[PDB]
């Protein structure tokens, strides 16, 4: 009931042993009381890394999208090493979503080593299990065995109805994932451990389908974009290898489903000036001239009977002489050209009325006239060429035209393919004009280039008219164990890709949220704009060039920081060599860098002078020691990891406050939320996520089926809690419910339509479904229902929630009215109370933790000691937590080397991995999440508690308590101990 404090462990040790005499009865009692539970106590175990590789094929349907929606691929496994590195080899094949699938090396959900199907955004098929949301469900197959050498796994995905299906060795699998969210794009992905060898089969040249694709499906190799090429690449990464060494990389920009849909601008609706019958007629004449000259250059001739094979022009007249189905076609395309030009922000009309008088045409010899003769002189347009603004106009006109064409195609049902299949109603141009390659863009522009050249030749009046910050910013820093507060230090940073790089020195108190240079904590230099940032910005020197190196260096002997580029010392506007001066030591400084999307750069701390370039020019001969020179092991660094995780209420938060009033008569204990700065300057408003720190867990077995009654109180299973919404707060943007331990949606535009949901349907060999399980990361109720159920009423909205831990059902009520929304869950599941709210008044919400008649309060549910005490209580451990988007994490010292190549046309792509790697995982029981033990270096409180826990282990093991020693051998293993001794970090 009072958190994890080491002083109580000290008390327990004192109870165990004192004055060299150990009370065996007390030691056995403490051991039997706390060790067998394996809860309320930190736990560690051996794990291995898991690496996932995608096929670089993105498919997903949307409204107006060009995706086919029925895809199929195959994977072959030929080398599996069972029980490698004293752990079962991981190997899974499936599909993953582009958004939400963010694997990281080490850690993650569960105990660690998350593969595909360990998150709701991913779905995997093991040898005989279906993996979704870190949940494994056994599936029946004709051959029930794990992934083995010489095995074939066929995966087929359908988007029209949300279906994922698998097939093993030709035997179809009667377990399919259904009713999943279609937001985003889906790509193939294989997760694996060491000692694996597989080959992809994507169809066509890249792999071959040993089994025929299901009818209506298409091979995945034909979904590649025109300018894209097939190449294996990680989902996202913050590091890469290069000739100099480790090159840190920023975020990876990726396409979205909304990019596939063509979004044009309406043009035909807009009226046009009366220039159409004066000057647009001459432009149409010029187009006729140029077209006739194209045929003249070709083998075409003037034959009145139209015959493409015989090269005969139907009109066969110098003047185009085209009839209404032909002349009006030309006139209307020119008219639509002007409509598009006006719609895209430009003008239509004349500016120079003597310009067409200046135009003199180009006279050509009679050889151009062939057969009847169709040579009109090309009107010379060299008088006015295409300005860059005019070229942009041509580009936008081509975009809009191809865009309206593509939307017409999609409305007809045209679906994009890498190849051109009109019989299947598919083109390589079905992607928007922006998504086209340079060839198709050129083909859809050149004619409009001629048209705009005609426009200019006549002299026309035409004239051209929050969380994203973390998604587009990545931060790396030196570990806080190397906080130097004196001396003269040099370190170099090479920026291989030009971008908004910010490299410099930062104080140990740098918040992950604050950008570099926006605060005084870091003296950074952003050379993309060529300025230096420290609590602002100021011009400094010149921007670098792609591949330049900057020698960021500091002297606390002189209390200054300077930046040099390629051995050239950067000057300020006044000419001062030092970028900053008067820099007090304070709390010290640490190397730091900030990278943007699609950006790469090496960071050399200066460990080796031989590889330290430009040191003689910049640092040497000035008394400036290279940083980390005497380091033997590589310097450990820390990266800003973007993953939403709940964190408690900061009592010093400038905008929100939480109060804890309890013990009032006729009112249960309650936690009140207030907005400190509402109705004032800088009153930020956005969706706020809150949850209670302790969860409630359902029974492992679902073996069901005035003055409260004491027997019903003792025998009841239901639990109740309420939320009070105050007046002033709109009942529309209020939410009350429960969240799974794997909810990481930090959406500022959050909605109940954005919750993850998936239906796992299990059938038999005959195909008859017998299981219809449902999984979701959030079980919470719509706020429009509350606002409908109810000007603002002074009555505080009371939202009651009832949960049965034995039967497994969830019911919601509003102000004494029972809502129709019911929920059913599975045994052995833990849920956290949570509310999502929009600040609309000074006082908004209040958790009421109480009890009803014959209903047991949540205090019993959380606490075993109070499991039978009807009085509701709020112990200090129970706190409120909101969701932090981005935090700090520690990069691994070593990275797995997986070798992937293209074996051949028949063999597809060969992927192999045989490098072992084993770190240690520390698992939090209540939060259901794991961390590396080495990450505890910066977390001293957890380190202190763990050290005192080990001391408690020794105390209960003291004086040769051999039974307790054996019990401890179960938790703390010989291999774990040996690896801990062998560890150096």
């Amino acid at each position: 009931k009072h958190g994890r404090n080491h002083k109580v462990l000290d008390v327990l040790c004192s109870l165990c042993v004192c004055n060299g005499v150990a009370v065996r009865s007390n030691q056995d009692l403490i051991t039997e009381n706390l060790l067998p539970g394996r809860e309320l106590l930190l736990q560690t175990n051996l794990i291995n890394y898991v690496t996932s590789i995608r096929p670089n094929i993105f498919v997903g349907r949307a409204e107006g999208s060009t995706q086919y929606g029925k895809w199929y691929f195959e994977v072959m496994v030929d080398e599996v090493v069972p029980f490698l590195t004293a752990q079962a080899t991981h190997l899974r094949v499936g599909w993953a979503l582009t958004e939400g699938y963010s694997p990281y090396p080490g850690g993650g959900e569960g105990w660690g080593g998350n593969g595909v199907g360990d998150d709701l955004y991913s779905y995997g098929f093991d040898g005989l299990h279906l993996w979704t949301g870190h949940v494994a469900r056994p599936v029946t197959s004709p051959g029930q065995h794990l992934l083995a050498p010489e095995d074939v796994v066929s995966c087929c995905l359908d988007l029209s109805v949300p279906s994922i299906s698998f097939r093993i060795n030709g035997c179809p699998v009667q377990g399919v994932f259904e009713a999943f969210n279609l937001d985003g794009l889906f790509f193939p992905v294989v997760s694996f451990s060491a000692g694996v060898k597989v080959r992809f089969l994507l169809g066509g040249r890249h792999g071959e389908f040993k089994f025929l694709p299901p009818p209506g499906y298409a091979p995945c190799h034909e979904a590649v974009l025109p300018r894209e090429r097939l190449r294996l690449e990680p989902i996202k990464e913050y590091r890469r290898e290069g000739p100099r060494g480790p090159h840190l990389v920023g975020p990876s920009r990726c396409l979205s489903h909304t990019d596939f849909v063509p979004c044009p601008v309406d043009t035909v609706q807009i009226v046009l000036p009366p220039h159409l019958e004066r000057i647009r007629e001459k432009l149409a004449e010029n187009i006729h001239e140029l077209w006739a000259l194209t045929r003249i250059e070709q083998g075409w001739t003037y034959g009145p009977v139209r015959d493409d094979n015989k090269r005969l022009h139907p009109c066969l007249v110098n003047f185009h002489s085209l009839p209404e189905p032909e002349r009006n076609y030309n006139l209307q395309m020119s008219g639509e050209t002007l409509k598009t030009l006006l719609a895209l922000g430009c003008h239509v009309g004349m500016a120079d009325e003597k310009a067409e008088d200046n135009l003199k045409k180009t006279k050509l010899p009679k050889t151009y006239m062939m057969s009847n003769g169709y040579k009109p002189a090309p009107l010379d347009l060299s008088h006015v060429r295409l300005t860059p603004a005019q070229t942009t106009l041509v580009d936008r006109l081509a975009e809009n035209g191809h865009n309206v064409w593509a939307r017409d195609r999609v409305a007809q049902g045209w679906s994009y393919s890498a190849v051109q299949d009109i019989p299947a109603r598919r083109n390589p141009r079905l992607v928007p004009y922006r998504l086209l390659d340079e060839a198709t863009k050129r083909s859809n522009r050149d004619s409009l280039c001629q048209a705009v050249r005609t426009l200019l030749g006549y002299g026309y009046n035409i004239e051209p008219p929050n969380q994203s910050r973390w998604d587009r910013v990545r931060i790396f820093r030196a570990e806080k164990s190397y906080t130097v507060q004196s001396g003269r230090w040099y370190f170099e940073f090479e920026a291989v890709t030009t971008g908004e790089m910010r490299v410099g020195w930062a104080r140990p108190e740098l918040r992950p949220d604050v950008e570099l240079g926006a605060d005084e904590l870091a003296y950074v230099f952003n050379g993309h704009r060529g300025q230096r940032w420290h609590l602002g910005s100021e011009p400094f020197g010149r921007p670098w060039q792609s591949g330049d190196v900057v020698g960021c260096m500091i002297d606390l002997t002189e209390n200054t920081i300077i930046f040099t580029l390629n051995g050239e010392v950067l000057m300020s506007d006044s000419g001062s060599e030092t970028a900053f001066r008067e820099i007090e030591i304070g709390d010290g400084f640490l190397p730091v860098c900030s990278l943007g999307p699609g950006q790469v750069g090496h960071l050399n701390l200066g460990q080796d002078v031989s590889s330290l370039r430009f040191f003689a020019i910049c640092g040497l001969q000035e008394g400036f020691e290279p940083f980390a020179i005497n380091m033997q092991r590589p310097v450990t660094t820390w990266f800003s990891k973007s993953l939403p995780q709940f964190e408690p209420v900061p009592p010093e938060h400038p905008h929100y406050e939480v109060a804890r009033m309890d013990g009032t008569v006729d009112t249960p204990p309650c936690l009140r939320l207030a907005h400190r700065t509402w109705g004032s300057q800088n009153s930020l408003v956005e969706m706020l996520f809150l949850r209670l720190s302790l969860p409630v867990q359902f029974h492992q077995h679902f073996r069901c089926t005035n003055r409260d009654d004491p027997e019903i109180i003792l025998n009841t299973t239901t639990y109740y809690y309420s939320v009070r919404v105050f007046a002033g707060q709109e009942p529309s943007c209020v939410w009350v419910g429960w969240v799974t331990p794997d909810y990481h949606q930090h959406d500022m535009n959050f909605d109940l339509s954005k919750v993850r949901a998936v239906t796992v349907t299990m059938g038999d060999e005959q195909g008859n479904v017998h299981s219809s399980l449902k999984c979701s990361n959030c079980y919470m109720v719509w706020g429009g229902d509350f606002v409908s159920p109810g000007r603002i009423s002074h009555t505080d909205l009371v939202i009651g929630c009832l949960v049965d831990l034995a039967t497994g059902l969830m019911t919601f009520t509003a102000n004494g009215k029972e809502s129709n929304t019911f929920f059913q869950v599975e045994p052995n599941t833990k849920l956290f109370p949570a509310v999502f709210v929009l600040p609309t008044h000074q006082n908004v919400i209040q958790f009421e933790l109480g009890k009803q008649k014959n209903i047991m309060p949540l205090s019993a549910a959380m606490f075993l000691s109070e499991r039978k005490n009807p009085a509701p209580q709020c112990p200090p451990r129970l706190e409120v937590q909101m969701l932090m988007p981005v935090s700090w994490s520690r990069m691994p010292n070593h990275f797995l080397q997986v070798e992937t190549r293209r074996a051949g046309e028949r063999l597809g792509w060969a992927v192999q991995c045989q490098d072992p790697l084993t770190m240690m995982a520390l698992h939090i029981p209540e939060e259901n999440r794991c961390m590396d033990i080495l990450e505890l270096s910066e977390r001293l409180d957890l380190q202190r508690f763990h050290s005192h826990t080990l001391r408690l282990y020794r105390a209960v093991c003291a004086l040769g308590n051999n039974r307790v020693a054996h019990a401890l051998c179960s938790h703390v293993d010989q291999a774990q101990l040996l690896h801990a001794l062998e560890d150096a970090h």
Partner: nanobody
Amino acid sequence: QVQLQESGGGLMQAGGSLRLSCTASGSIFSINSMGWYRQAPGKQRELVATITSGNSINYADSVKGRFTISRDNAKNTVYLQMNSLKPEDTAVYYCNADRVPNGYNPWGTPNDEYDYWGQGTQVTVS
């Protein structure tokens, strides 16, 4: 949307009268041409004599026989009479509509890609 519905192509002895009616229902705009195509089981769709709104008829190598074509823009109806039947002539026939006129387009690839095929019908020669 411009949907072209095609009906006809009865089976009987060679030389039997076969008239195919295709009507193009859709936006009246960009309706100036009318193509025809034939593909036999297992071979490509070659162009039939294509007529455009100005009653401009373009023949090809596959017009061997009688292929009387007659169109009408009053209700976007086109009748193709391949009343001559030959063993090679057996094919699925399709009717196509497009803005491109007289099989040419100074505009370029957009309008070119602006094709609107139809449901078609089957023709067999016995």
